[model samples]
Target: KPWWEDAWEVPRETLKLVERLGAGQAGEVWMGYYNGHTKVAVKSLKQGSMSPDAFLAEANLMKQLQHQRLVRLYAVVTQEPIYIITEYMENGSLVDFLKTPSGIKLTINKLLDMAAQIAEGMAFIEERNYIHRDLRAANILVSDTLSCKIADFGLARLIEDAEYTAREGAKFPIKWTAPEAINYGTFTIKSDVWSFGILLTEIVTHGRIPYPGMTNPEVIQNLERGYRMVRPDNCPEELYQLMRLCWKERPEDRPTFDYLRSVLEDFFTAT
Candidate 1:
């Protein structure tokens, strides 16, 4: 079968569900063993949740895209109760990892390392002309070695068709979203950059809730009034400055992911 065809199949019996990782809007994720030995993550979509064509399209896109810092798609089971198989992240989500008891011990360098890895992954995505619409700590996966990799590409799309239209009054993660995306439904790499700023805050604060004590309405109101989250205590001023650059009012004012990667690399080298 062709690359976009339904030939990417795996025997259902080969996957042994180990544990349910978590559930999101799209589906429930499970830790599984593929072929009885290879560790994998299975994302099982609910019946009628996504059209077959759209799922296949997403699978094909994911299969074609691969990088060290981006989660790897291994296979897809298109049969009943569709499954998306990808590399298992031993440490699960970055947000949850940071909230763990031992996570508080992370040094500033370690936190910056995680941030740099994420930036490297995003730079690769931007280089491919793709926009990761949902860029946040929860969507980032971590390995046992504390290696960070970007995951959850359900909302990712090509920059050429960057605009995403959400129905009026739709609910989204307001804390990590760009002002333009929240108000006008416009999405692009620059909007992703805006989210990266929030992710940096998440790293520095060790997973503290963004926009603490504020409801969604309050977040929107404050964002419109030119207010942004303050820098985390003891966060390096240079890093905080970079975060502010990402929050510039005009999307055009935000630096590209490549620039972010370079700056982060320099910071790592200098200190």
Candidate 2:
């Protein structure tokens, strides 16, 4: 039960691994076969990365959450490598999509689909009092049908957990973080609203990574000086205004997820 085990084992009844999908600092994911017909994605945590207590807590949370817009966490199998099985996304991550030859002009409808799904997923998480400490294009996964599912919750934490603190890879993205997050390590549901604004711009701007051509300190300076990401041409003015309001320095000034949902709904209707 120590946090440093190497390989894990999945139940014979659960999943049969066919090929490795990807690997990261957290662990590895595989394209797996299940029940002789179902294709699933299995993420195996590096043995010791998740202690029994943490894994149970996460599994409990995942089991109770049922959002069509978010990735579904199915079963957690802890044999050798500690595997977390979930639905597989065949379209891949937004980061990979942006690297394609037809990247930027990949269609506005597709962009809207991804953005809307992400916001919906985030709204649900916020409603549960959880913060997805890391929310970026890279962490957003898309399925073959163009549906988006927020992934990589290794940095996720409950807002009420006093011991919950951002560290290492959990550091807020300078260009995407709100002024409040930069000045104070404190982050709230509203801070996520701010990051969503940056995310909105990043997607529209063809995935120009945050802090492009600027040092971390310079990003803070620019934000403090009232600089915001430039609105792309043909970008709706209402969308621009929404982004601006979301990036407000004061957390209290940010709109609630419900409010954002309503506003975005209106935008879709109007456009």
**Top TM-score prediction, candidate number:** 1
Clashing pairs in 2: 3-48, 4-48, 5-48, 7-80, 7-81, 8-80, 8-81, 9-80
Per-model CA lDDT versus the true structure: 0.85, 0.72
Q: Write the per-residue lDDT of candidate 2 for residues 1-271, one digit (tens) a residue.
A: 3323412234647678888889876678898877778888887777676575565455555655668877887666765657777878887787676667755567665676567778888899888888776677877887877677888776576778432445544466677666655666767788788888877777676677765677878877777688876666656677789888887767888887677777776666555
TM-scores of the models, in the order given? 0.92, 0.84
Clashes of each: 0, 8
- Candidate 1, 239-263: lDDT as tens digits: 9999999999999999999899888
State residue 180's C-alpha deviation in candidate 1, in Å: 1.0
Query: After superposing candidate 2, which stretches have Cα over 4 Å from the reference?
Result: 1-13, 48-57, 101-105, 161-170
- Candidate 1 residue pairs in backbone clash: none
